[PDB]
């Protein structure tokens with residue numbers, strides 16, 4: 418199935434405060450009115466390419482969609498990134514794991530060969546995430562505040578503020594989502610150019626894509 | 636000697652300030668970097684190797700000067716080894732009976748590759764094949780104790796040696812030394828360096 | 836092989852069993868075989884010094900050859 | 901400090917006395933000083949090479965520490 422992402426997926430590109438100014442930046446963005454592969458896996462989590470960052474969203478307000486495994490070969494040979502929610506601590510393990518056939522998680526482990534790095538941190542809800550990996554830094558953006566502009570569809574405008582930065586410095590090409598044992602979107606982003614509007618506070622209240630429409634280019 | 640506990644020193648603000656300033660450390664010799672560069676380069680990850688040897692065997696741990704300990708127990712390549720730290724543990728170790736737990740390997744097939752650990756214990760010599768047992772004209776069980784009784788001289792007194800050889804230039808920096816700070820001023824023409832953001 | 840080589844090959848077995856005892860972390864028997872090692876060390880030194888060998892009462896391993 | 905640093909620190913004194921001999925312009929004791937300087941150079945070279953140490957009859961400077 419396919420779905421149209423109207424204008425979602427705009428994040429703060431840097432840590433610079435601005436106020437009442439229209440700033441145009443060239444960065445990796447998700448173009449407006451694009452196609453996202455609607456996944457509805459219930460009573461089915463295929464491996465998807467990373468392809469220079471991904472978009473992500475969800476709509477279920479309970480702990481069923483938990484983890485995101487990243488890597489290049491999905492085996493103990495190559496370093497593999499893992500992020501899993503425990504509802505009390507977010508565990509991040511970049512250590513090598515062997516192939517997981519039918520991983521079940523919810524609040525799989527084969528072997529931690531050559532373990533090197535670890536990290537520990539802290540209408541329905543929408544969990545929209547943006548994953549980016551540039552120059553050895555893995556950036557994760559998030560926004561856990563849902564807006565019910567329309568029902569059963571993700572329409573509206575919301576900005577994404579950064580949460581964590583990981584200096585892991587690994588090469589990843591494929592990623593997969595982890596579920597339990599018994600509805601998430603995917604979008605790819607290209608190096609577009611946007612014009613963003615700042616409020617009195619340093620909040621982004623409106624953005625304009627400018628490779629989509631001659632009015633927008635104007 | 637035959638083994639060593641290698642530990643992951645990462646995600647750290649490592650001072651290196653209390654080190655090299657205290658006189659407890661008998662030998663503090665560094666090769667890759669000059670010992671004075673506390674916040675040197677913000678290197679990527681650190682290796683730490685700890686073991687206990689005799690007094691004389693300290694010179695063999697350094698690159699070159701290969702000896703019995705260096706040949707068959709611990710091989711250090713000729714590279715930018717960070718620093719070598721050694722002190723005397725005659726007070727803590729060296730019971731009146733004599734510590735027998737510390738072991739070293741005198742017989743091995745070939746010199747161990749750099750940073751390769753051999754925990755296995757097995758019969759080595761064979762030759763005439765009387766082996767698969769400790770009794771034999773050529774079996775020569777490899778490990779032998781040290782005998783670190785207090786009456787032994789400083790040459791044979793046990794020394795506790797830690798080899799700090801940090802990893803170099805292989806990933807984005809994760810561990811680095813602390814950054815000095817100072818108080819701030821107001822209403823004066825002062826140039827500033829807020830988190831690397833320079834300006835006047 | 837005379838007496839020197841026999842005692843030199845003899846003592847290494849006691850070194851090996853001392854090492855095995857240390858691996859077993861039981862230091863009771865380790866002290867006894869360490870005393871045996873020191874006895875054979877001084878025996879070898881005494882033989883090489885050119886003095887009567889006390890081979891009459893020293894303990895015996897399983898095998899002469 | 902082991903032995904290496906001690907000899908390396910000793911050799912500087914003898915290079916210094918070589919320098920003073922050169923400045924005072926008599927090459928008599930300068931030759932002897934240079935000979936003992938090369939002797940120490942060989943001493944550090946062999947010690948770093950891992951060879952028997954002739955610290956028994958080599959000349960000594962005023963101070964051990």
Ligand SMILES: *[C@@H]1O[C@H](CO)[C@@H](O)[C@H](O)[C@H]1NC(C)=O
Pocket residue numbers: 503505506507508537
């Ligand atoms: C986070 O969850 C609990 C809270 O204490 C505890 O098991 C631990 O701190 C963390 N769990 C992990 C890391 O699996």
Ligand SMILES: *[C@@H]1O[C@H](CO)[C@@H](O)[C@H](O)[C@H]1NC(C)=O
Pocket residue numbers: 530531
């Ligand atoms: C994985 O385990 C094997 C065990 O034989 C080891 O040789 C290898 O070094 C490990 N992987 C890494 C990346 O160290």
Ligand SMILES: *[C@@H]1O[C@H](CO)[C@@H](O)[C@H](O)[C@H]1NC(C)=O
Pocket residue numbers: 616617618
């Ligand atoms: C800015 O933040 C303040 C904080 O309470 C809020 O009251 C205000 O509505 C926000 N927007 C503007 C334009 O001030």
